[PDB]
């Protein structure tokens, strides 16, 4: 019964603390989310200074409860269903032939603000690599996210790959593995497999002098 929660535009707050190959950094993200349209709008700041890794790489990490679930599919909205209480999102993201990322985040409401708090741990990155070497283009493609229920952990398992465009026209693969679990002891909706169609556009704020990333994104469920 989290749907009444996402009836209008909801403020979003994003906080991440990370360490990549001994590279410590932090980001703060503020924005709005309008589930009715599967639309998200945020701005991220690298508070500790210059971001050690590349922006496009943090996107997946930086609130699926803002996805638009068509009417005929609401019974599958696990995300909104964990609402108010929230849920845990954990991930292992393997960058092909490079390091991998480990994440644990908590997705919940604090008052009337939607909060995503994350701790990220990065290891085995090559300094002479795409990531560390900053060789990714500042852009992003559309992707499908497959969702299947994890009846066991009373949650869901998600799989998907992201392709990051390399500056030489090449592509860097990012294999994502993710599990979600409700924070409460309340009931949630366990869905049948389906997927989320995600579009994203990264931009920059001219008048913004700090290290950041502006983000616009739309997400709609389908495959059902």
UniProtKB/Swiss-Prot annotation:
Result, substituting residue 193 to S: In EBFP1.2; shifts the excitation and emission spectra to shorter wavelengths and increases quantum yields compared to BFP
UniProt modification remark: Contains a chromophore consisting of modified amino acid residues. Maturation of the chromophore requires nothing other than molecular oxygen.
Mutagenesis / variant outcome for changing residue 166 to L: In R10-3; matures to the red-emitting state with excitation and emission maxima at 555 and 585 nm, respectively
Outcome following mutation: residue 64 to L: In RSGFP4; increases fluorescence and shifts the major exitation peak to 489-490 nm
Mutagenesis or variant effect for residue 94 to S: In alphaGFP/cycle 3 GFP; improves folding at 37 degrees Celsius, reduces aggregation at high concentrations, and increases the diffusibility of the protein inside cells
Biotech uses: Green fluorescent protein has been engineered to produce a vast number of variously colored mutants, fusion proteins, and biosensors. Further generation of mutants led to more stable proteins (at 37 degrees Celsius for example) with brighter fluorescence and longer fluorescence lifetimes.
Effect of mutating residue 123 to V: In EBFP2.0; shifts the excitation and emission spectra to shorter wavelengths and increases quantum yields compared to BFP
Effect the entry attributes to changing residue 170 to G: In GFPA; leads to enhanced fluorescence at 37 degrees Celsius. In Venus; leads to yellow fluorescence, improved maturation and reduced environmental sensitivity
UniProt-reported outcome of changing residue 143 to D: In Cerulean; leads to improved quantum yield, a higher extinction coefficient and is 2.5-fold brighter than ECFP
Reported effect, residue 63 to L: In EYFP; leads to yellow fluorescence, folds faster and more efficiently at 37 degrees Celsius and has superior solubility and brightness
UniProt-reported outcome of changing residue 201 to V: In EBFP1.2; shifts the excitation and emission spectra to shorter wavelengths and increases quantum yields compared to BFP
Effect of residue 198 to Y: Gives rise to yellow-emission variants. In EYFP; leads to yellow fluorescence, folds faster and more efficiently at 37 degrees Celsius and has superior solubility and brightness
Keywords, in A-Z order: Chromophore, Luminescence, Photoprotein
GO BP term (any one): bioluminescence
Name of protein: Green fluorescent protein
Organism: Aequorea victoria
Lineage of producing organism: Eukaryota, Metazoa, Cnidaria, Hydrozoa, Hydroidolina
């Amino acid at each position: 019964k989290g749907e009444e929660l996402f009836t209008g535009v909801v403020p979003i707050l994003v906080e991440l603390d990370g360490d990549v190959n001994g590279h410590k950094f932090s980001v703060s993200g503020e924005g709005e989310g309008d589930a009715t349209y599967g639309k998200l709008t945020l701005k991220f700041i690298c508070t500790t200074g210059k971001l050690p890794v590349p922006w496009p790489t943090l996107v997946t990490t930086f609130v699926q409860c803002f996805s638009r679930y068509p009417d005929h599919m609401k019974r599958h909205d696990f995300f909104k269903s964990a609402m108010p209480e929230g849920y845990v999102q954990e991930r292992t993201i393997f960058f092909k032939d490079d390091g991998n990322y480990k994440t644990r985040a908590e997705v919940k409401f604090e008052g009337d603000t939607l909060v995503n708090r994350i701790e990220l741990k990065g290891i085995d990155f090559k300094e002479d690599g795409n990531i560390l070497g900053h060789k990714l283009e500042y852009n992003y493609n559309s992707h499908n996210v497959y969702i299947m229920a994890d009846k066991q952990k009373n949650g869901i398992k998600v799989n998907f790959k992201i392709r990051h465009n390399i500056e030489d026209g090449s592509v860097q693969l990012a294999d994502h593995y993710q599990q979600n679990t409700p924070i409460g002891d309340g009931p949630v909706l366990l869905p049948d497999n389906h997927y989320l169609s995600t579009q994203s556009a990264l931009s920059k704020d001219p008048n913004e002098k700090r290290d950041h990333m502006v983000l616009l994104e739309f997400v709609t469920a389908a495959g059902i």
